[PDB]
Design a binder for this molecule. Sequence first.
Ligand code: NA
Ligand code: NA
Ligand code: NA
Lengths: 130, 130, 115, 115
Amino acid sequence: NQAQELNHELELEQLETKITVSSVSLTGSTLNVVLENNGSTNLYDFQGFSVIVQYYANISNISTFNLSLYNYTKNSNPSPYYWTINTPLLAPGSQATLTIILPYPPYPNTQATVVIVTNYGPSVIWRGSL
Amino acid sequence: NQAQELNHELELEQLETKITVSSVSLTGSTLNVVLENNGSTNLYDFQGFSVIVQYYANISNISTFNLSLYNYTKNSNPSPYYWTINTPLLAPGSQATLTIILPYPPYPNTQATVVIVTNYGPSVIWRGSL
Amino acid sequence: MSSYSIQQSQKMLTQLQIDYATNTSSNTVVAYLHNVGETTISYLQNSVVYFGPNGQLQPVGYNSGSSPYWTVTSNSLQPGSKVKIIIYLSSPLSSNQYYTIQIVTPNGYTVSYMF
Amino acid sequence: MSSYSIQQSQKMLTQLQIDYATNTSSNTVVAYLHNVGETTISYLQNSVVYFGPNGQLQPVGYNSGSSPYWTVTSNSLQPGSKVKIIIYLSSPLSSNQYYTIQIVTPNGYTVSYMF
Ligand code: NA
Ligand code: NA
Ligand code: NA
C-alpha cells in the first residue's frame, strides 16, 4: 500500500534531519545566519522552509517589537521580508550563509529570536542580541 | 464536528500529563518506585498504563537479561509480572508508591531501566543499579 | 541513578505543525501554521481553535469581528506552505503566565504551541 | 548566543506510540506498541515494519518463518491496550551502533523507536 510507503519515507526523513546555528551577525538591516547541516538528509527545498524573526526594530529612535515570516527567494537582490542562501543544496556536514532582509535596522543591544524550520519539520531556535 | 472535539480534549490531556520518579528501592523481588504527578490531570486508569522493566535477573546465581511488560492489578500482594499502586487515584501534586513484582531478585549491582507510561502517553524512564 | 520524562527515542510522523507562536501585543496572538506533510489541507476556515492560559483554554470563533476571534491568511495549505493565524482577544494577557494555542483541522489533525 | 534544535513548546496529538524497544539477544528485537488514542486499530498483520541500523533500515516481512521476519501478540489493538512485536534477524547486531525500528499501520500511522 502506498500511503504506508510515503509515510515511511517521510518519517525517516524527519528523523534524520537536523540543523544548528553556528553564528549570527548583523549589518545594517541584513541579518546573516550561518546554518550547519548536522543530519543525514540534503536540504534544498527552501520554498518549504520557514524563517521567522522576532526582534526590536529602530523606528524613529523608538525600539518597537517586530514579528515576521520571511519567504525564500533566488533573487540576488532580495526585498525586506525575504531571505536567500548562498548554496543550491546544503549537504550533510556543510555550512551555508542565510541572508535575511529585515524591514528596519535592529535597535542596539536588544534581544531577538530567530526560528529556522526545514521543509521536513525539524527546526532550530536562536536567541541572542542584535 | 465531534472528531475535532474529541481530538481537542485528548491532546490537551496529553499536554497536561507529566510524571517523575522520586526514588527507587528494592527488597527481594519487590521493586518500589515512588511516582510523582507533576501535571494537572488525575491519573487512575492504571490498566492503560505501561510498566516495562529491563534488568538482570539472578537465575540460579547466573545473571540473565530480562525484559518484560507488567500488567496492573488492584491486589496489594501481586504475582510475578504484575504491579500495583497504593492509591486508586494519584492527584496532581501527590505521590504514590508503585510496587512491581519481579520474577527473580536482581543480580547484585546490575543496571536496569524502568519505563512507566501513563495511559495518556507521557512517560518516565529511570536508569540505575539494582 | 538517572530519570527523565518522555524520550528523544520515541517519535512519530509529523504532517502539520505550528512553527512559532507568541503574542504581538496584549490583545493579539500570532501563530504560523506549517504543512510539512505531503497532501493539501483544505477548508481551514472550518478549523477549531482554542486559546488560553495553560489549563484554561477557551474556544475561539472564526472571523466574527468581535473578540475573541481568529483569522487565517488563506483557507488552504499546500505541502510546504505556511499560513498566519491571528487571534484577537478581549482582555489582556498576563506577563507571568504560560499560554497555549491549539488548532484542530477539519480532517482532525491536532497541533498546539505553548509560549 | 543560545541555540536549540526543535522545541518542547510544539506538540501534536499522539494516538499510537512505541513505549520501549531494545534487542533481547544478538538476533532478536522486542518493541512494545501502545494505543493511547480512542479508536480501535485493526488488521495489525497488514502493517509494514522496517528495521535496521540508523539510516539503513530494511523492510521486514510478517510471520514468514524465515529471517528477517516479525510477529505480534494480537492483530487488533483497543484503546489502552499494548501488544508486543518481535523481530527475528538473520545476522547479529553490532554492539557499537544505534538501531531504529519503525512501524506503519494499514491506516498509515507511523511510529518509530531508536535504541
Ligand atoms: Na482529570
Ligand atoms: Na479574551
Ligand atoms: Na537480518
